[model samples]
Target: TFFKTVYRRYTNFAIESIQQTINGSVGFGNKVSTQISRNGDLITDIVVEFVLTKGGNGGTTYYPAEELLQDVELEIGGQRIDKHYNDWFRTYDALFRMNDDRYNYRRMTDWVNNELVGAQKRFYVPLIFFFNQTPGLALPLIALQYHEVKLYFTLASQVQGVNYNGSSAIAGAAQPTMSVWVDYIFLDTQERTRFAQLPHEYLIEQLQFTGSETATPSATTQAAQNIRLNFNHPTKYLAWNFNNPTNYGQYTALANIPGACSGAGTAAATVTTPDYGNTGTYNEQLAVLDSAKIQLNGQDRFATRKGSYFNKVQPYQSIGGVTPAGVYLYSFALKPAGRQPSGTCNFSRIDNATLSLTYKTCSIDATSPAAVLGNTETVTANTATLLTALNIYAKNYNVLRIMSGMGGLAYAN
Candidate 1:
């Protein structure tokens, strides 16, 4: 019955797990020949293990289907919502799993309400992107798009998975968990700006909001204000719609903006509406159609594989297999429009400073040479160039600090 009544939107941004990590990598030990006995036949339970680094930096792994494993079968209403890949709900749930955070989807909504709105709306430029979800066979295919991809980042020449000896081999060896390196291209909203600092004007449209509902109002205020201050001079601007304690649907982008001050008087310090249910207001900032495909290792399993389901032995494995499982070789490139990274630079100042952004959402051309298995290929000689440029600027901007802060938290510094 729970599944019948459970709403998709409510759970969309909810955290599947606060923290979970896998160390080193493992193997099936079984033959892969068994999986594809037939071309389209669906395989149910396959025991697989994730090989993780013996011990080093830490990180958390979130499994979408695993969270709904038991609830997948429960009935909510007269209609049985099948927990199959064919079901839209299942697809969305799996997509949310890879997101930086579920609540992050509405980040802009909260930002505009807490920091923008009234005469105090201020903020630096903004950046926006819609994490695209693509399902395929044998790989995770994710791509990132900026305003249209003003810049591009290439993975560092390295790989994230381990190589197992033939299908017959199992656990005697291990491979360090390989990182699927990705590039975050800053996009331009196409808006004009005062400074000629960069080639284009970009803003940070969204951010990863990890705090729970407890900081609901404050966190919203903090994030919005930081941007507002960066743009509008940082005055305390509050959206009347957000101030209403009642009419929560307003946050979901539904209904009107609430009644005027409840006739309770426009007191900068006054309490008002208590009916914050079904609140509404659509923030046009999110362009659903735009996307960015994330590439990691040799495969793009995140979205490439189709129909996600739970595996008993493993929390949740992509529908596709991690083909060419081995140490992948690649490079990381920070291809922003203007300026470049210096080999030796600093970015610690980024802690509280507003980073003026140029957002672009671009995708990899399908025609490009995509790798299927571990093979020797010629890497663009400029790979090192991109890395140098990125690190230099990252150093100056303190981006490494941000990565270290966020990434370090997962691996626990």
Candidate 2:
């Protein structure tokens, strides 16, 4: 009689498909979901496979890997996480570039635009806990002793999911068909009921955000978008970027048919398409912000509003430490310090808070090219003006109690 090592190099998982729609092309607004059977273990990832159909058009356009996911939901017994979950993942792709492998493990790839028409694409959508790669830190698969965990996802509309070549809007385009499956990690023991030594009370965290915060373009005074929200749980961090919704949805006539963008230092010279379509490329972040101000409850939190000079240089010192051209990003650590899993720290409370982002006057630069690499149009490299609405994506380090037999599914404290 002998005991095995508690540490496991490879996770013991059984990959099984739960949602496999009919062979017909699935459209926008379609739902894909399933309920997991009772099992006590760990889930590392969920794989999504789908084909973005080639509709009734000869246009050459490819959807980004991030766009494939509209909203991914996870409901454990009573607690649930949904709405804008898809967008959150795209933001996560940009945020957690170091916690694991950079671009190799995620859905990112080197496929060109000409290659993706009517092909089945497979993407790995990791749950929130997957970001923490440390052993015993992941949230356990709780369908076994506790309540049933439900996985649901609604497809994103054509705006983010599909963009045909004829125009920017959705036409008679073929819908994208997709399926989802779960990847569970079990113990290395011979028995099936044996569970790992996971923490009883672990935090079930999620990413939340506000809709587009619009700003009136002004020259004399700074243009700003002031938004207000209420946060109940202890804080973790905040991240934001600015973009014009109209520009974000507009489809550019990509120069994939050769010679369409062929030239020297002109706009044509910069029409080189990315190997893989990504939101980071299409979503050109506004680069002319003035300052950021935060007021919590009733008191002003900042001694001096974060200025543009400091805002522009934030990403380099952040977790990812990477931001492409024109992709202006702002990140702030709300909590003094915290560790993974439990997420205990010197907490900051915000009941009703207002966030204000003031921007500089935007104008088309004739001397410098306005070439925001991943934007919707052909390179405007200096011939275009800059304007955008702020989009906030924040990380919540909420608390959860998962006591095995004591009705393990508690609330997000």
Candidate 3:
């Protein structure tokens, strides 16, 4: 009714009747959905009925106080909650500030690292158990509710080279590589209830990359150890979302991790860890490249290719003097699909994995250190809640947040 009145107040109307009656000096009526009039005695408002109420038989309908629009008193200590016109306004600004040159990237890194560790420790290995404890009403607001999980790869093709720097001998040079997969599981209400009780399910989605278009998996690298899941992809991908939604491409994993080269082989070259790790107190995004050079024989040979790298990240805080949270690392290797096995050599298999999510509520209204009130705990709580709220807002408009990891989840009709 309140919104209806507001809508009507803002909407334009036209006069439908202004006629003379037998004893009336004048008669007037207007065509309008709603109206608000100020008479000499009191304030009055009107709402047009359509679906539930008809003009002739209209009575009254009730709405809960919280759901209804009522004037809130804003005096001292009065229960007045200012409606947030744009909840993302402050968040967007803070995110920009955090990325600015003035900010101390190190402290933010430390804070993220500490909080992520704590979250992992606190949650334990029960992936979705704790989440199941949350009531149904909460699900509507969850932004990232573990609808799926994926394994992304930073892949490169191996190149041939020579020890003499260009003599008669030559070696294979490595190519650039990147891929992803997910092991996901979907649950119906009945299944969700069962999971709530047992916290486990047989449903799963598996994906192993079969191939790629941009780059090739190192054929020489053994599928067993060479192919590792790249944890850095999440943070990098998340960062990419800054300019555009990164959910468009299909996230895929090859059926096989690259295999160790069988021909004349030198000791495997050193592989460098993805450097998106701790550079300082905050999640040092810009400086992530400082340690991100690709490793060859544990040596950073790709330092010249740093500018092309990218990242995606969630909002986090910086400890006064610590670095932000480090990213997770997942790596894998692959071999030609039709390759054959002989002697003692074994082949690798490719497939998809399933991801399942369970969500629970976490609050931040506790008595913590007021001095650093909006630090780790507050940020984490807000991160989860805001994401959830975004989900609700999308649902209210009948929109869906599609999980995109191409072929990473269970394909359904």
All models: lDDT? 0.17, 0.46, 0.17
**Each prediction's RMSD to truth:** 28.6, 7.1, 30.4
* lDDT of model number 1: 0.17
**CA error at residue 46 for candidate 2, angstroms:** 1.3
User: Which number leads on TM-score?
Assistant: 2
Structural similarity to truth (TM-score) of each candidate: 0.17, 0.69, 0.16
Please tell me which model should have the higher TM-score, number 2 or number 3. 2
Q: Give the poorly placed runs of model 1, Cα more than 4 Å off.
A: 1-207, 210-271, 274-278, 281-351, 354-413
Model 2 worst lDDT window (10 residues): 249-258
Worst lDDT 10-window in candidate 3: 390-399
Regions of model 3 farther than 4 Å from truth: 1-134, 137-227, 230-280, 283-325, 328-413
Which number leads on lDDT? 2
* lDDT score for residue 27 of model 2: 67
